Structure formats: structure tokens, C-alpha cells
């Protein structure tokens, strides 16, 4: 059916035709950053002694 639509015909002649492209899809979203461990004691300004 793809070949028929591609060629604008209800009849397809013998031969090889490119009709579509194949594309592999991703399965998940992965984001990476370092451990950082570079935080300031912001909350100790609030929770001051």
C-alpha cells in the first residue's frame, strides 16, 4: 500500500522502490551531572546556633 501511494498508482510495476525511511527511536531520557557536593550551609544561616 505504501508503494502504491508513493507511486500515485493502484498498479505497481515490477521493480524495487524506496517508499519510506526506517528510524530507530530512543527509549528513555538520561541526564548526567557530577556528584557536585559543592553546597554552602545556606540552611545553617537560617538554622543558626
Amino acid at each position: 500500500s505504501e508503494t502504491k501511494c508513493t507511486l500515485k498508482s493502484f498498479t505497481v510495476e515490477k521493480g524495487i522502490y524506496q517508499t519510506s525511511n526506517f528510524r530507530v527511536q530512543p527509549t528513555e531520557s538520561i541526564v548526567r551531572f557530577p556528584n557536585i557536593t559543592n553546597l554552602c550551609p545556606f540552611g545553617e544561616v537560617f538554622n543558626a546556633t
Partner: protein, 164 residues
């Protein structure tokens, strides 16, 4: 990865980067290799398969069975791996035949009888042999006359366009 985005398959790389280099480059500067942000190692980023798909048709007035070729695809029914892509729906045989519908890399397809689409190595011509000898000659004793036809285009349709 940090500020690097895109889509691809992530595998281990066999390359190493200097400690301050975070990303690497291909021939036209695509960002590809990256150091993993938490455990610096070189990660390999390679694109996913994206080739074209072609349909092999034996002819509508013969059969509605078709075979399908995937151009850059690894096959990993009637699945056969060709050097021109993964072929689905065709029976590979060990007999050579002249080409009908070509696939590529020496492989052609045709429709044959209990009919199916088959795949084969192309035949390059009839096997023959010239019996070379240093003291023997072949000489024609009769002849035939052949008439053949050669066709050449001479002209193209003449056209004109009113631009405005």
C-alpha cells in the same frame, strides 16, 4: 551530559582524553565522545539506525507478495542479511541467476516457483571455454544475417514560460 544533548547509543569508548577535555569531535565537528560527569571515562556516542526502506515488487499483475529491504539495518520470516541491508521476506538460494530486480553488492531478487521471492548471487554470464591450441584454427563454413535496432533520442520538447 552537563550541557551536551542529543540522541544516540551510549557504549564504552577505546579513546582517552586529556583531564580537562570533556567532549570530543568527528570529521565535521559533531560532538560525539563525552567524559561521564560522575565517573570520568570516555563514553562513546554513536547514532541509531536510520536507513531507507525499499519494497521489492514482483509486479502487481503477478503477485501481491513483496520483500522488504532495510538499507543500514543489521537483522540482529525469511530474514537474510545482505551487504546492502537486511532483507525480510525472501528465500535465499545457492543457485546463481541473471538479475531481475537488483538489491546491491552482487545480490538480485526474482520471483520463482509454490511461488516466492528469492534472493541470489547474480550470474555474470554463460560459462564458456575457448580451446586454445598453438596448431589449431576454427574457421566459419556458413553465416547468417542479423538486423538489429538502435534507438536514440534527438530532441526534447521545446517550452517557454511567462515569468510574470
Amino acid at each position: 551530559f552537563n550541557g551536551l544533548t542529543g540522541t544516540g547509543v551510549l557504549t564504552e569508548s577505546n579513546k582517552k582524553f586529556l583531564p580537562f577535555q570533556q567532549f570530543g569531535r568527528d570529521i565535521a565537528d559533531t560532538t560525539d565522545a563525552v567524559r561521564d560527569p560522575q565517573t570520568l571515562e570516555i563514553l562513546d556516542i554513536t547514532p541509531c539506525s536510520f536507513g531507507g526502506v525499499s519494497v521489492i515488487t514482483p509486479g502487481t499483475n503477478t503477485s501481491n507478495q513483496v520483500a522488504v529491504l532495510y538499507q543500514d539495518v543489521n537483522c540482529t520470516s525469511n530474514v537474510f542479511q545482505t551487504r546492502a541491508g537486511c532483507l525480510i521476506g525472501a528465500e535465499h538460494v545457492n543457485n546463481s541467476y541473471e538479475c531481475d530486480i537488483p538489491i546491491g553488492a552482487g545480490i538480485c531478487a526474482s520471483y520463482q516457483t509454490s511461488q516466492s521471492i528469492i534472493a541470489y548471487t547474480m550470474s555474470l554470464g554463460a560459462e564458456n571455454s575457448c580451446a586454445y591450441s598453438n596448431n589449431s584454427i576454427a574457421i566459419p563454413t556458413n553465416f547468417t544475417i542479423s538486423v538489429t535496432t538502435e534507438i536514440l533520442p534527438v530532441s526534447m520538447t521545446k517550452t517557454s514560460v511567462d515569468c510574470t
